[PDB]
Design brief:
This protein has one domain. It is built from 17 helices and no strands. The protein is elongated, with a radius of gyration of 20 Å. It starts with a helix and ends with a helix. It is classed as peptide binding protein. Keywords: repeat protein, designed Armadillo repeat protein, peptide binding protein. The assembly is monomeric.
């Protein structure tokens, strides 16, 4: 098959050959989980990371496509990506002017954070815990949405996983965010608060300490039905 053959093409030298390979390197990943594994063993995981650190925009716009394509696999397949050493290589892309590249930067990163606790602990370590919260207060909603997926994904584990979140400083970026005329941010933030509150008393009060309760109380009398129910479930929770 042309599985391994494509891997070699991921060694720079020829841009034409490299690009052509990229296109036919991700398209296959978006066909089945088993297909992803084939790419891993093939030795493309580490070959892709190297591309992440390239000036070309085309090779980059594609490098992410095939990348995240794997991050959306299984809890195990997602680990392979980390073992290759793309965690830090991807975080860098986040500091790119080309929004197009930044978008994918999250579609892959956050994707991995949605794995398991065993992987989360590794993220909260070096991962930009507090830095991720700062993004929450960004104008470009595009980054805001994805930013929520990453942070939230990290708070999808045991109690210890929830604590790490509050420590980062999401209480303010969330609570204060509750006061938003945007239905999106309204449900988003709310969904985040409840998540953390789901933990113990330390995880609950921690949030309410900011003043989310107020925003929640007012939500009780919100037009939207869904927002009303969710708001009621989060309110009592804090208690």
């Amino acid at each position: 098959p042309d599985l391994p053959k494509l891997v070699k093409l991921l060694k720079s030298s020829n841009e034409e050959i490299l690009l052509k390979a990229l296109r036919a390197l991700a398209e296959i990943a978006s066909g089945g989980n088993e297909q992803i594994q084939a790419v891993i063993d093939a030795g493309a995981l580490p070959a892709l990371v190297q591309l992440l650190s390239s000036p070309n925009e085309q090779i980059l716009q594609e490098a992410l496509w095939a990348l995240s394509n794997i991050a959306s696999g299984g809890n195990e397949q997602i680990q392979a990506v980390i073992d290759a050493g793309a965690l830090p290589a991807l975080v860098q892309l986040l500091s790119s002017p080309n929004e197009q590249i930044l978008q994918e930067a999250l579609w892959a990163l956050s994707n991995i954070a949605s794995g398991g606790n065993e992987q989360i602990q590794a993220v909260i370590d070096a991962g930009a815990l507090p830095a991720l919260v700062q993004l929450l207060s960004s104008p470009n909603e595009q980054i805001l949405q994805e930013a929520l997926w990453a942070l939230s994904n990290i708070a999808s584990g045991g109690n210890e996983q929830i604590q790490a979140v509050i420590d980062a400083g999401a209480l303010p970026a969330l609570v204060q965010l509750l006061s938003s005329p945007n239905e999106q941010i309204l449900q988003e933030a709310l969904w985040a608060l409840s998540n953390i509150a789901s933990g113990g008393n330390e995880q609950k009060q921690a949030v309410k300490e900011a003043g989310a309760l107020e925003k929640l109380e007012q939500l009780q009398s919100h037009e939207n039905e869904k927002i009303q129910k969710e708001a009621q479930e989060a309110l009592e929770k804090l208690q």
